[PDB]
Amino acid sequence: DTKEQRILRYVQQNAKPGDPQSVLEAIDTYCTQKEWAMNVGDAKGQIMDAVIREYSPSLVLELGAYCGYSAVRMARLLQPGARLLTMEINPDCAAITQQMLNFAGLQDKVTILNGASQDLIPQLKKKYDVDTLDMVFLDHWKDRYLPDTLLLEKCGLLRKGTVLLADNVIVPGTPDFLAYVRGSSSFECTHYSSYLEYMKVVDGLEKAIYQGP
Numbered sequence: 281d282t283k284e285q286r287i288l289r290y291v292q293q294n295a296k297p298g299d300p301q302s303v304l305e306a307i308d309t310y311c312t313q314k315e316w317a318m319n320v321g322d323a324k325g326q327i328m329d330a331v332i333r334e335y336s337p338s339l340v341l342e343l344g345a346y347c348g349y350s351a352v353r354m355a356r357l358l359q360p361g362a363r364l365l366t367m368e369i370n371p372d373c374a375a376i377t378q379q380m381l382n383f384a385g386l387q388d389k390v391t392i393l394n395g396a397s398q399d400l401i402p403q404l405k406k407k408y409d410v411d412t413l414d415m416v417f418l419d420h421w422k423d424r425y426l427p428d429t430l431l432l433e434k435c436g437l438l439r440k441g442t443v444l445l446a447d448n449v450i451v452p453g454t455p456d457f458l459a460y461v462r463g464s465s466s467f468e469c470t471h472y473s474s475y476l477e478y479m480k481v482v483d484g485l486e487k488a489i490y491q492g493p
């Protein structure tokens with residue numbers, strides 16, 4: 281079996297069904313004591329929780345699901361009837377994420393879309409009945425962050441106040457995306473310095489709030 285399958289099985293055997301916080305703790309314990317994995321983790325996750333609670337977004341888009349850690353982390357703090365869509369290119373990972381959300385009791389709040397972000401984004405309005413997004417979590421692949429931000433804008437999915445939250449802007453790093461948002465009048469940017477998941481290595485989140493054309 282794969283690392284991701286082992287993480288899910290660990291959850292299943294060391295967390296409580298229906299209890300999101302127990303799911304996060306189990307994933308964090310496994311990835312600290314057994315095998316590292318690229319979940320946003322607890323240090324950055326606490327900054328993410330702070331953001332979610334500030335904005336209480338009704339519709340969140342996540343780019344990059346992996347095993348579902350971040351989807352559990354966000355979806356557990358959404359208000360009733362609020363929703364998360366998450367896009368995942370790797371079908372094995374999509375199936376793990378679904379099972380993770382199911383285990384957590386969050387499946388009614390989350391839709392996992394199996395496909396590439398750049399193919400799915402153009403289908404959100406007509407196929408997923410989306411108007412505009414309240415928040416975007418970018419956490420898929422460093423080289424897609426800029427192109428997919430620009431695509432989201434093109435497709436009319438951002439509105440004044442939409443919150444872009446970007447993982448890994450330091451490690452692996454996303455220099456094109458950062459230089460672009462920081463230098464654009466269309467974005468109000470703040471940097472949240474932290475650590476790479478499970479590691480004593482500096483990393484951070486970028487918050488970029490869309491301000492209109």
Ligand SMILES: Nc1ncnc2c1ncn2[C@@H]1O[C@H](CSCC[C@H](N)C(=O)O)[C@@H](O)[C@H]1O
Binds near residue numbers: 318345351398420
């Ligand atoms: N273009 C793309 N579209 C969708 N998913 C992508 C993608 N490029 C990479 N990915 C997916 O992005 C994920 C990065 S890891 C995501 C971690 C997750 N947000 C968490 O914190 O728990 C991987 O599962 C990878 O398959």
Ligand SMILES: O=c1[nH]cnc2c(O)cc(-c3ccc(F)cc3)cc12
Binds near residue numbers: 344419422476
């Ligand atoms: O590719 C990644 N996508 C999404 N999130 C990531 C993430 O949080 C960490 C890393 C990562 C960081 C250091 C390293 F040595 C190897 C991989 C990659 C991704």
Ligand SMILES: [Cl-]
Binds near residue numbers: 322
């Ligand atoms: Cl951590």
Ligand SMILES: [Mg+2]
Binds near residue numbers: 319320419447448
């Ligand atoms: Mg990440």
